[PDB]
């Protein structure tokens, strides 16, 4: 099925998946001189302090830290949502070199890794019904650049070690994520999609200006996971980006 391959790859995309030459995808190249300050956008709201890990799993693309979304314990609003967004996992797209990694980019430049933190609109009632709305999901975005350690991820690096291989898990509780916020909420937000299969289209993104740095031997971490299970030939977790996309007269909006 998809992946990152030379034959599985973002470019195959569409065969399976047509909306991937639809009008908004996701990622998109954000160019700071012609996005629009927009003074009515209002400060993001993240309420993380009493949310509830639950397992981290490798899913065979990426590895997912899931959260209990039963009841609005890590929530998401304001800025230039209406309602309130419950976080369900956060994970991330790292590159093989340090050069790339991220799927959005600004200015063209490249990070080494992106975070999403992913949520949904509680409006909707389930994920699923989220996904089938325009409004359905939000999107935390974050920029990591290679430099210093950063603390609060250690705990999920140490962990990668039991989930080397596509459908592991373990458990993974009292993992909070306010550790993995940059000091400043400044951000970009425009109507997008998800960055994988089935490409859905009912994403508002919201990116941070202020990248987080992460050390070399923590990003180095990420590149040893598999892409394939257990008892298969091995091919190393990297590159599980996507190319940046056609804005197609969207507008991107700042926060700043
Ligand atoms: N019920 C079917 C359709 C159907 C109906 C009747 C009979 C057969 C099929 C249906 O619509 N299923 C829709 C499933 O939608 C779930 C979306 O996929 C789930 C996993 N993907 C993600 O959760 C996901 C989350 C975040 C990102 S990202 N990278 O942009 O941050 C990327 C992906
Ligand atoms: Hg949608
Ligand atoms: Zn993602």
């Known amino acids: 099925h998809w992946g990152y ?13 047509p909306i991937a030459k ?28 009493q949310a509830t890990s639950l397992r ?17 314990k890590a929530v998401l609003k304001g800025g230039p949502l ?45 994920f699923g019904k989220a996904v089938q709305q325009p409004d359905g999901l939000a999107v935390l975005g974050i920029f990591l650049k290679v430099g210093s350690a950063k603390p609060g991820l250690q ?10 291989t596509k459908g592991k898990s373990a458990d993974f509780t009292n993992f909070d994520p306010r550790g993995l916020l940059p000091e400043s909420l400044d951000y970009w937000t425009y109507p997008g999609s998800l960055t994988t299969p089935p490409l859905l289209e009912c ?6 200006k202020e990248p987080i740095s992460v050390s070399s031997e923590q990003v180095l971490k990420f590149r040893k996971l598999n892409f394939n299970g257990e008892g298969e030939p091995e091919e190393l977790m990297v590159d599980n980006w996507r ?11 700042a926060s700043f």
């Open 243 to 253: 190319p940046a996309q056609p804005l197609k007269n969207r507008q991107i909006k």
């Open 155 to 164: 705990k999920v690096v140490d962990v990668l070690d039991s989930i080397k």
């Open 5 to 17: 391959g030379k034959h599985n790859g973002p470019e195959h995309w569409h065969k399976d998946f």
């Open 22 to 49: 639809g009008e908004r995808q996701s990622p998109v190249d954000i160019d700071t001189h012609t996005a629009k300050y927009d003074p009515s956008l209002k400060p993001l709201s993240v309420s993380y302090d």
């Open 56 to 72: 981290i799993l490798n899913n065979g693309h990426a590895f997912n830290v899931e959260f209990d979304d039963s009841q609005d």
């Open 82 to 126: 209406d309602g309130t967004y419950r976080l369900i996992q956060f994970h991330f797209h790292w590159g093989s070199l340090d050069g790339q990694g991220s799927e959005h980019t600004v200015d063209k430049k490249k990070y080494a890794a992106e975070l999403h933190l992913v949520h949904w609109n509680t409006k909707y009632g389930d």
């Open 203 to 208: 994403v508002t993104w919201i990116v941070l």
